Amino acid sequence: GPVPSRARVYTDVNTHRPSEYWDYESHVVEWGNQDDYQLVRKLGRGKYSEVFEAINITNNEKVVVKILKPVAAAKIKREIKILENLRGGPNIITLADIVKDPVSRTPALVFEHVNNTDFKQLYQTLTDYDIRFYMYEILKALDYCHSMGIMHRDVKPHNVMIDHEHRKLRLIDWGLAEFYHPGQEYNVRVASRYFKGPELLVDYQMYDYSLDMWSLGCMLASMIFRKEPFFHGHDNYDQLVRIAKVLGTEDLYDYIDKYNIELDPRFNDILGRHSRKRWERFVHSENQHLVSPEALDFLDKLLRYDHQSRLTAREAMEHPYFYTVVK
Ligand SMILES: CCc1ccccc1-c1c(Cl)cc(CNCCc2nc3ccccc3[nH]2)cc1Cl
Ligand SMILES: Cc1ccc(O)c(C(=O)O)c1
């Protein structure tokens, strides 16, 4: 069957830490007072929660309230334990309180408020320097959570809040996050389609922190090439075909052969034979201001089929792409 895999970094973090650190099912939730929070407006509804702008009337400060839907309400201890474990970490959203919503009868997580800059303005106007700056801030959050034995598993632009006036970034929505335990087989039905790593698309369950690095590469490629999303699959199968049209089929077969993975036979009629493309094929006069040899080299080291061959977050921080960033 499949060849086992383990991360090349941070394998032992959940062994070295006490059981109370990762055994989220044993965690006893300390409930706060729902009456301290006044809901102001609904910001959005996803498939697992409804999010609101609210005011903490005990200190008059703005907060964000995430009310979990009953479907996500089962694995709430996992999200709470992860958020408490990571609290105070660089660029990690701060969990301020946990209350019982009187209407839904479900847990409601209260977060610090971020004065978000409009998402379309950021995509359309961040400069080459700003993209490097914010990519470095995301790496700080990813290396921190990985070093803490946690994989986010849903890295995408919707889950990164930026307050551009204060050069402030937060990695949010830890609802799909999981503790990394070497040898554990995880659910491949994680991350949004355009950010899913090849390991998820070929149904390889023994993945690790490196899944986050593929997702980060998809964000970078979209941003620098002005191509939203970069890998535009119609469904999860066409998603791998879109990746293979760029990275090539030969390296895909080398990857599946290394791990003794067998592709779903439905790929026989859709995958084809594709050469690896040079990253310069995606450069044009409308994105040249965002591209550099360093950007392409960095992207090349994230977007690799072999999850064990991608840059780790800490190695990525010393890449030449970030030399221009004020540290
Ligand atoms: C295209 C991804 C990207 C690549 C390189 C550098 C920066 C970005 C980026 C952009 Cl342009 C915009 C955002 C802004 N995303 C906002 C998401 C958001 N805003 C919310 C407001 C309320 C509730 C949830 C929310 N989620 C984040 C990033 Cl990482
Ligand atoms: C501050 C904030 C806003 C919206 C969200 O969905 C989250 C979260 O899920 O952690 C956090």
Coordinates of N, CA, C and O and ligand atoms in Angstrom, one line a residue, residues 49 51 64 66 79 83 93 111-114 158 161 172-174, ligand 2:
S49 N -19.9 28.6 10.1 CA -20.2 29.6 11.1 C -20.8 30.8 10.5 O -20.8 31.0 9.3
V51 N -20.3 35.0 11.2 CA -19.4 36.0 11.8 C -20.0 37.4 11.9 O -20.7 37.8 10.9
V64 N -14.9 40.6 17.1 CA -15.5 39.8 16.1 C -16.0 38.6 16.8 O -15.3 38.0 17.6
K66 N -17.8 34.8 16.3 CA -18.0 33.8 15.4 C -18.9 32.7 16.0 O -18.6 32.1 17.0
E79 N -10.7 23.5 17.8 CA -10.5 24.9 17.5 C -10.1 25.8 18.8 O -9.1 26.6 18.7
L83 N -6.5 27.6 19.4 CA -6.5 29.0 19.6 C -5.8 29.4 20.9 O -5.1 30.4 20.9
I93 N -4.5 35.3 15.1 CA -5.6 35.9 15.7 C -5.8 35.6 17.2 O -5.6 34.4 17.6
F111 N -13.1 37.2 19.1 CA -11.8 37.5 18.7 C -11.5 39.0 18.7 O -12.4 39.8 18.7
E112 N -10.2 39.4 18.8 CA -9.8 40.8 18.7 C -10.3 41.2 17.3 O -10.4 40.4 16.4
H113 N -10.5 42.5 17.2 CA -11.0 43.1 15.9 C -9.8 43.6 15.2 O -8.9 44.2 15.7
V114 N -9.8 43.4 13.8 CA -8.8 43.9 12.9 C -9.6 44.8 12.0 O -10.5 44.4 11.4
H158 N -8.9 34.6 2.1 CA -10.0 34.8 2.9 C -9.6 34.7 4.4 O -10.2 35.3 5.3
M161 N -6.3 38.3 7.4 CA -6.8 39.7 7.6 C -5.6 40.6 7.5 O -4.6 40.4 8.2
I172 N -6.4 33.9 10.5 CA -7.6 33.5 11.1 C -8.2 32.2 10.7 O -7.6 31.5 9.8
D173 N -9.4 31.8 11.2 CA -10.2 30.6 11.0 C -9.4 29.4 11.1 O -9.0 28.7 10.1
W174 N -9.2 29.0 12.4 CA -8.5 27.8 12.8 C -9.4 26.6 13.0 O -9.0 25.6 13.5
Ligands
LIG2 C1 -11.3 38.1 13.5 C2 -12.0 37.0 12.8 C3 -13.0 37.3 11.8 C4 -13.6 36.3 11.1 C5 -13.3 35.0 11.4 O1 -13.9 34.0 10.7 C6 -12.3 34.7 12.3 C7 -12.0 33.2 12.7 O2 -12.7 32.3 12.2 O3 -11.1 33.1 13.5 C8 -11.7 35.7 13.0

